[PDB]
Design a protein around this ligand. Sequence first.
Ligand code: HEM
Ligand code: HEM
Ligand SMILES: [C-]#N
Ligand SMILES: [C-]#N
Ligand SMILES: [Mg+2]
Ligand SMILES: [Mg+2]
Lengths: 110, 110
Amino acid sequence: AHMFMAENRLQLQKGSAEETIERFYNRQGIETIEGFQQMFVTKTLNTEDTDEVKILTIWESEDSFNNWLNSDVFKEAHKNVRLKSDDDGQQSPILSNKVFKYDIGYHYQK
Amino acid sequence: AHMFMAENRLQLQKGSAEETIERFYNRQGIETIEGFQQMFVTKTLNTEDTDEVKILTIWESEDSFNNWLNSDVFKEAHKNVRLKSDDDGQQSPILSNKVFKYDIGYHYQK
Ligand code: HEM
Ligand code: HEM
Ligand SMILES: [C-]#N
Ligand SMILES: [C-]#N
Ligand SMILES: [Mg+2]
Ligand SMILES: [Mg+2]
């Protein structure tokens, strides 16, 4: 079976990538889901408009990822997360998210 | 120092993702580059008119990637690569490519 990747792509106010990335430093349970393998948190370089941060999660299968989405740990990690558009979210630099899903056709680790 | 990711995004004619991914199975020298750590080749899951394949390379530093990009082994790996838009690109399903660069702010591997 091929590995699977899920990306959450954060659209952020200009300059807010760093303060946003720091929120991802301490784990909140994703690592306890069977089939979770790796996570990367990236800042897109050379952006001229909004900042862009991507959260890449690598899994044994799409099923594993779905299991995390359906978990209480997913809820607990996101319980205080607000978009700028939320009623109490005016101060958030997070404008929107978009999820992308991928089949990993090849992987190599040195 | 932060890890670094360079991505080559390929826009491909519909149905050609699988045949294109197979071209990346066999290494052509990138593994010999000091600082090279991982590579992923992905197919985006969606309902679009074109296929999309991304090549993600993970490095100890941006310097590492620059060394590879400017290397003889990079040149060799790509010497027979053509785009559909090229004069001799008749058999190529590759419509275009775009490079994206990222600082890796955080990484976790189970
Ligand atoms: C609904 C929109 C979402 C927004 C605005 C958002 C943003 C955030 C933020 C700000 C954090 C850190 C929270 C904190 O300060 O403690 C977080 C946690 C996290 N998010 Fe999201 N997120 C969303 C949904 C998703 C989705 C769909 C994914 C799938 C890739 C994802 C992946 C992650 C991961 C892997 C963590 C860390 C989880 C852990 O350590 O257990 N998020 N998210
Ligand atoms: C100029 C546009 C490019 C196109 C159309 C392209 C497409 C391709 C193709 C089709 C292959 C496999 C060739 C074969 O059949 O042997 C390949 C090799 C490869 N490409 Fe690209 N590529 C381009 C530039 C880049 C860039 C900028 C990167 C940076 C991430 C990259 C990353 C890779 C990697 C890691 C390999 C495998 C190299 C090895 O194993 O040593 N390519 N590319
Ligand atoms: C969460 N991204
Ligand atoms: C090369 N992608
Ligand atoms: Mg900037
Ligand atoms: Mg502007």
